[PDB]
Symmetry: D2
Subunit: 422 residues, 4 copies
């Protein structure tokens, strides 16, 4: 029964053609949904009660669109998101962190506009986790956003939105200085011929997967759900294909900001992403990612490849990793393991930000500290296992891969262990 679920016959296929032939509508997804859902906050999704339903439906990142509304309006949205998120903190083994992303208005006819400088300062003051920088055309646009965030906003992730021909052409220099990319198909589809957007999307997703940096697919993914309870056949296909392309995140704009079915739009993206993740041809994907990732003398990078290889060998239910900044989890995620990457962290910001990386499930550690560092590490590992058991990721008898470091502090991951559950 195990080998009939999660498209495992299609996953073992010798060719991509045979993989397609073996895809089965009766093969149920079992793994937790890996691709994060970004929901745009607006009148249809601003109330605390509505936000609680969206968190339960699968929203991982709340997007604030600074193209509309005042700073007072957005501060209220942030407070409501935090209130809804913290209403589940009473049960630490099931608490789900939710990131807050600020999407800038953009340069308009102008580099960095004066309104963007003020909005970015607002983001730092209100503790946003991510900035979706509009109309990034070159590396200096990213540097300007980074400078406007100042010394207090050093830890904020900058996701550059590629929205025009210049951004596509200067993609490599933009990705090099950004934390990730958003394929902003709305403006891109007006700036370049609409029939060419899929080429830009597939290229950018492929280059971000190669670089090991997050990539978001955005705009009109479930557009008809703004007024209708069910999406069109092209919309479900678009969501599934963005996941199959390799997108780390998928986004909802008007569907959640102003539509009549915000919760249903989140549920639909969750349902499709789960089905599409199981249909990924891991046999070829892992081989190509493994071959393309350069040789490295960084122990975190070396441990990450060893751990993902070990996870595939034993059909590991999860890879439990201890991380301070999220980096060790990101390096595991870049190899696209089928095993869930359970990231145990003390940082609340890193727990929110790792939603940008596909297949990373953040667990915010709030248990009493241990006096012995080795005992403290072992307790965080057992915490990952208990949360994993409660959430359905793990069962007794499963094998897990555990990734830790040799000393406290970020940058010292160098150990991989094979552990049998219970």
């Amino acid at each position: 029964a195990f080998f009939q679920q999660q498209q495992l016959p299609a996953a073992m296929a010798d060719t991509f053609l045979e993989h397609l032939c073996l895809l089965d509508i009766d093969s149920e997804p079992v793994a937790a949904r890996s691709t994060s859902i970004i929901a745009t906050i607006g009148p249809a999704s601003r109330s605390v009660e509505r936000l609680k339903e969206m968190i339960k439906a699968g929203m991982n990142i709340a997007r604030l669109n600074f193209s509309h509304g005042s700073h007072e309006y957005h501060a209220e949205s942030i407070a409501n998101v935090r209130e809804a998120v913290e209403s589940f903190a009473g049960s630490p083994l099931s608490y789900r962190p939710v990131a807050i992303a600020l999407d800038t208005k953009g340069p308009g006819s102008g580099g960095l506009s004066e309104q963007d400088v003020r909005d970015l300062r607002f983001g730092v003051e209100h503790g946003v986790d991510i900035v979706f920088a509009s109309f990034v055309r070159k590396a200096s646009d990213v540097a300007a956003v980074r400078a406007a965030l100042g010394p207090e906003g050093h830890g904020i992730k900058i996701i550059s939105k590629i929205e025009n021909h210049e951004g596509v052409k200067r993609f490599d220099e933009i990705l090099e200085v950004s934390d990730g990319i958003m394929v902003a198909r709305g403006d891109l589809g007006i700036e370049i011929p609409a029939e060419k957007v899929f080429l830009a999307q597939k290229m950018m997703i492929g280059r971000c997967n190669l670089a090991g940096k997050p990539v978001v697919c955005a705009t009109q993914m479930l557009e008809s759900m703004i007024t209708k309870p069910r999406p069109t056949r092209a919309e479900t296909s678009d969501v599934a294909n963005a996941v199959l392309d390799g997108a780390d995140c998928i986004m909802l704009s008007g569907e959640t900001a102003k539509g009549n079915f915000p919760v249903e739009a989140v549920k639909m993206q969750h349902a499709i992403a789960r089905e599409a993740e199981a249909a990924v041809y891991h046999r070829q994907l892992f081989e190509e990612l493994r071959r393309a990732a350069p040789l490295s003398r960084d122990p975190t990078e070396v441990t990450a490849i060893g751990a993902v290889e070990a996870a595939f060998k034993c059909c590991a239910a999860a890879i439990i990793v201890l991380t301070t900044t999220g980096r060790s989890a990101q390096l595991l995620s870049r190899y696209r393991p089928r095993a869930a990457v359970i990231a145990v962290t003390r940082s609340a910001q890193a727990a929110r930000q790792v939603h940008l990386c596909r297949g990373v499930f953040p667990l915010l550690y709030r248990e009493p500290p241990e006096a012995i560092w080795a005992d403290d590490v072992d307790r965080r590992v057992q915490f990952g296992i208990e949360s994993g058991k409660l959430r359905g990721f793990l069962r007794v008898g499963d094998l897990v891969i555990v990734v830790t470091g040799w000393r406290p502090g970020s940058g010292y991951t160098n150990i991989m262990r094979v552990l049998s559950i219970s």
Copy 2:
């Protein structure tokens, strides 16, 4: 010899990539498509696309197959639609550069446990009016296809039966249905109601893959550009859906309400044409050909053996086209199953085969009406030169180009066994 500009167009850098990941990384929005659009467009005929003048614009925009939806309208209404399609098609018989055969497909109302009384009557109407294809609704098992085949009476055995897979049973019994059908339609509308909507993409990709493996045509249908029923431009999900259906391996893409009742029927056809052209150049032929080659069983059929040799030869020299002489369309279909980048120009004396080969990706039919030569080898040479001259006229070919020519050793269907490399003069 060809120029550096030649190797920058039609995603040739992405086509030469060593891995699928590198192929994606090399896709370029500035790399323009050059080849003719190979995925056929099926447009549903209705009030918005029934007039002769509107049909002429749709033919110019790229419509290859006219679909008659027998779920609505009387036999009198459909006979008028057929006459208007034929009038619009024949209005271009004067210009070889603009003339294009257009197939007529009858889409049945559907079942009841099996073939309904109305379907028997509608299928008889199709035979009497000379339709080329039947899109059989709600096919669930092999016996449903046999019933449709039996209903195509004594005169309609040459009509192609494309089984529409619309429910869980059709998906589960797919292999037995494909074995007896000429092709398949992934009817996503009903399929998305019969099975969970989030599972339709799995059924679509599986069926397209199995049809590509079998070498049989597969159509992707329903809501591909739905928003264009009221809006002049489609959504980002809709263009993505069309491009991904072509990348999946679909031979045909379809328009329903977009062309039958919408406000922008011609623009919907133009949009599918534009997207299919871009998506066909983005196909990763290096891995696709290797896998089709490996999956296709060994064969002692000379048409099958010649077809793979010809497609291999076309890739080796970047041939502008493969010109094939075919009476039934079968030799062109066997070339099409290996997905060559070269256009397959099919020269036939059969007007029905010329219309039906639109079901096969990359087949460009040319109907030949010259009187037969007394010396058979001369008749063959005249048809090969007709394909070359039409190719030059239409932009497929130029003097100095290499073309692959596929012919047989004797007259009659079933004897294809020759592949030649010709330099265009």
Copy 3:
């Protein structure tokens, strides 16, 4: 039949990985194909008798090597006369006649920087006596090949020059030497003294790989069955060395003392024949063909395009042979470079080309002696029928087999452009 798929290591040939290919190799799977790697036998006191040469031709000797390091011009002229007498003793049966090439192996430069005066005289002797091939000793750079070509003069333009790589400089300047040579000999004797003995296998494997990539013949030479100079059976290392040279991709394997001075020249030829046959069936064609196709550059030459189409067609149908008409041997060489499992039966009127194509693996030359038919198409057909009848007599073909036939559109060399699938009747 099921028995067909158990022979010639067909289970190992269909394997998905090289490891699984090795695991499926079967000592009970009998070779069926004709032996495709040519055997070069060096002539000497043990192999000069006309009666002894007839037995060596029957055992499988394809090329007779004259070592100009020993003997005078008078000695070599007698060797040539004896070889020709033994070869021509079988000309009374044209369907079974086996051409045998004559190769002149030069003494070398010695302490000199380039072409020695003795080599100039020996090369002129070769042209005057009609030798087919020159094995040029100690080639260190492209100008050494040009000097050999100049010494052959205008009358020796058709002689093939195979450069012997015997030292570090020849290995380092390999690419420039191969570019101007017709082929290469891995002369392991001197190479093993000039460079550390433990590194010779790396030079052998590299040169064979680069010659296979270039589509040019490569010979493996020296001490392959050394112990057979005095013993009736070779050592385990010797049979392994012959099998591995064939698996590496060598077009030819050579015997020196084993045939020139030993006590078992006929048995040494028979042993190389037996081993080469076993090793050719053990070649992993699935990966080899894929890599040769991918590495071979795109081409606009119709002979090159037809060759890859014909090899692909031959693999698709398990063709027993590819029958090719050739004037210079070039069309057969271009088929051979893709390493088909099907025998390449080359029909030619040129006695020299028939002898020289033994340099290319899997090419079986048939010398056609009949004067041309008045109708060129009938002369082409008669030559193809001669290939089929010789093939049937020699066991290459049976009724019911499929064969690929490679011809051109006009008389004269350079116009091959047609591939046809033919059933043997």
Copy 4:
């Protein structure tokens, strides 16, 4: 180039020109052959073990010391010749020569002793002389038995029974010498510790032109099973009377290594020939060149794909460690092992990194020579009170010995493989350590 650019800038272009690294990074096997370079020097320690047959030409203690220095890893006693008294003296001389280097534990090289049986002769199974010789082997503490003419699984069970309860730790390597052994190979391999391709008798029992097929098939199946395979007979035959081998002989040795053989053997070349030390030196030189010419890119991919999914933590850790070693061009993989099993599971994936196996078992240290690329280090120190400290001391012993023997330099990355509790069977940890 993008996949190796940063590491090329860090380690230098000279590093990437050595040990056939350009040929190792090739995208196809054809390109791998085209990139093989006679100027690309081998750097890694020789990983294929050399088995030398002991006889009159290689019996003296002083001669044996030269053969150990030349590279002999396993001493073979051919029980087809000589009495029990003769073989006991050979064993004592081998042990005396081996122990003459024990004064320096950081450089001491263990040498295994293998007993090669006379065989069944005309009989259907285990002969009475073989039963007596096998009992002699157990009494004299031999490490390995090369069982002659194994034709079926019951032949190896008979050898195992003749070894008795005291010989349970002895490795049984079945010699495949006839058609029946080749045809029943899978059942023989399943119950054996490894295989020997005995080409001498095999070449008489089956047509000589078919021996290479049997050799390549058996080596491939042993590599797939992760069990040692020995290539034997006439590898450097001419060196019995001549100082240099023929071109076919060097080719045969190189091709046995490229085929995937864990061990290569010398028979008459060492036992009775005129150049025993030179024959060992020649096999050493060729094996080093051939190991660097192995196409690891395809080999690792195929071993990974063919090896079934596993829930055994030693197996899971082994593939993770070999993958990690390739990622960083690790100089070595240091593994703690009691029976040799954790080192054998690393060896089956054919890493380019040397597998330095630290063990307290003198027998396991000798027996791991059967596995390609395993360098045994015998740890003689008594256990620390705290088990975690005892583990760390053993790892440090491997690093210090690795530095001493030239395997490791400061700045190198090393992969360390250990377990969560004492005793055999609990390996489950992989660590990436930077050498300081």
